[PDB]
């Protein structure tokens, strides 16, 4: 016998494989720094937002930290642990195959009826918009999510059923080169 599979350092790499966008040198730095500020290692919803705020004091990342944190966690404890915290930050940058697509869907389904709803869309789509800006790009451009919203759903639920299931998402998304831009705006930058 030897080491199982539930530790922090080292165990991460083994799992974070195919991604690990934070070589040991990094996660180790925050590890000791995070446990120092919290010997119990527990990032609560409040903390989460606090970090997003300082990052974008000009925006209002409120429902953002909520939606995500809500459709996250694994121990249903109401608190994000170190390994869990970075899991979020990681998926934020870089990805791979449809894996990133499936995850996004679950996040948009504010509820869980295996089906998404226009209500759950505007709410989320609005969170990513009210968060980051758009003038840091190049060509001035703007649009109340109301427009991009009607566009995102119009192409997602191209089957008429009030609600849309993941299956339809991967299809209308993986194909129609357009919904990905917005849908991605939420997931995270490149
Ligand atoms: Ca947790
Ligand atoms: Ca739904
Ligand atoms: Ca549908």
List the structure tokens of 69. 């944190």
> Considering the domain boundaries, does residue 1 fall inside one?
no
Among all ligands shown, which has an atom nearest to the Cα of 116?
2
- Cα of 161 from ligand 3 centre, angstroms: 5
Q: Are residues 120 and 150 in the same domain?
A: yes
Strand partners, 116: 164
Q: Is residue 2 part of a domain?
A: no
Q: Which domain holds residue 181?
A: 97-190
* Shared domain check, 113 and 177: yes
Distance, CA 86 to ligand 2 centroid (Å)?
Answer: 27
CATH number at residue 19: 1.10.238.10
> What are the respective helix, strand and coil percentages of the chain, to the nearest 5?
55, 5, 40
Task: Compute the Cα dihedral for 113, 105, 121, 171 and give only its sign.
Answer: negative
CB-based contact 87:68 (threshold 8 Å): no
Question: Quick one: 102 and 185 in the same domain?
Answer: yes
Contact 164, 116 (CB under 8 A): yes
Q: Which of 74, 96, 118 is the last residue of a domain?
A: 96
Using alpha carbons only, give the angle 49, 115, 177 rounded to the nearest 5 degrees: 80
Give the integer Cα–Cα distance in Å for 31 and 34. Answer: 5
Round to whole Å and give the CA distance between 88 and 84. Answer: 7
Contact criterion met (CB below 8 Å) for 144 and 121: no
């Amino acid at each position: 016998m030897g080491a199982k599979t539930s530790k922090l350092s080292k165990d991460d790499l083994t799992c974070l494989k195919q991604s690990t966008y934070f070589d040991r040198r990094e996660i180790q730095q925050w590890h000791k720094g995070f446990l120092r500020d919290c010997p119990s290692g527990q990032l609560a919803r409040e903390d989460f937002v606090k970090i997003y705020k300082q990052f974008f004091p000009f925006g209002s990342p409120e429902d953002f930290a909520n939606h995500l944190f809500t459709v996250f966690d694994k121990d249903n404890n109401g608190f994000i642990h170190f390994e869990e915290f970075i899991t979020v930050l990681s998926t934020t940058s870089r990805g791979t195959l449809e894996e990133k697509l499936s995850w996004a869907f679950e996040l948009y389904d504010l509820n869980h009826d295996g089906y998404i709803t226009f209500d759950e869309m505007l709410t989320i789509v609005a969170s990513v918009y009210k968060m980051m800006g758009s003038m840091v790009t190049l060509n001035e451009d703007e649009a109340t999510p109301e427009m991009r919203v009607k566009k995102i759903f119009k192409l997602m639920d191209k089957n008429e059923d009030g609600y849309i299931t993941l299956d339809e998402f991967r299809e209308g998304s993986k194909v129609d080169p357009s919904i990905i831009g917005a849908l991605n705006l939420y997931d995270g930058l490149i």
